[PDB]
Structure 1
Amino acid sequence: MVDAFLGTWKLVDSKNFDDYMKSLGVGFATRQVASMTKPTTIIEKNGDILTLKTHSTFKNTEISFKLGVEFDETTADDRKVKSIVTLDGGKLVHLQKWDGQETTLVRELIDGKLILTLTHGTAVCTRTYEKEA
Structure 2
Amino acid sequence: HMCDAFVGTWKLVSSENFDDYMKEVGVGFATRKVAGMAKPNMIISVNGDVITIKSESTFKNTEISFILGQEFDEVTADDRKVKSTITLDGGVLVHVQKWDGKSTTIKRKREDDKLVVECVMKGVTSTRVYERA
Instruction: Give 3-state SS (helix, strand or coil) of 1:19's partner.
Output: helix
Letter in 1 for 2:117: L
* Partner-residue secondary structure (3-state), 1:68: coil
Alpha-carbon displacement from aligned partner over 1:51-100 (angstroms, at most 9, x marks no partner): 11111100011110011111122323333322111100111111111343
Q: Do structure 1's residue 10 and structure 2's residue 49 form an aligned pair?
A: no
Output the TM-score relative to the length of structure 1.
0.93
RMSD (CA atoms): 1.3
Shift of 1:101: 2.2
Q: Identical aligned pairs, as a percentage?
A: 64
Q: TM-score scaled by structure 2? A: 0.93
Tell me how far 1:104 sits from its aligned partner.
0.5
2:60 matched to 1:64? no
**Counterpart check, 1:113 vs 2:110:** no
Cα distance in 1 between the residues matched to 2:81 and 2:60? 18
Aligned to 1:101: 102
Q: In structure 2, what residue type is equivalent to 1:8? A: T
Partner of 1:36: 37
Partner of 1:86: 87
Q: Structure 1: how far apart are the matches of 2:112 and 2:72?
A: 31
Alignment correspondent of 2:55: 54
Q: Which secondary structure state, in structure 1, belongs to the residue aligned with residue 45 of structure 2?
A: strand
Gaps of 5+ in 2: none
Contact 2:3 2:46 in 1 (8 A): no
More strand by share: 2
Structure 1's unaligned 5+ residue stretches are none
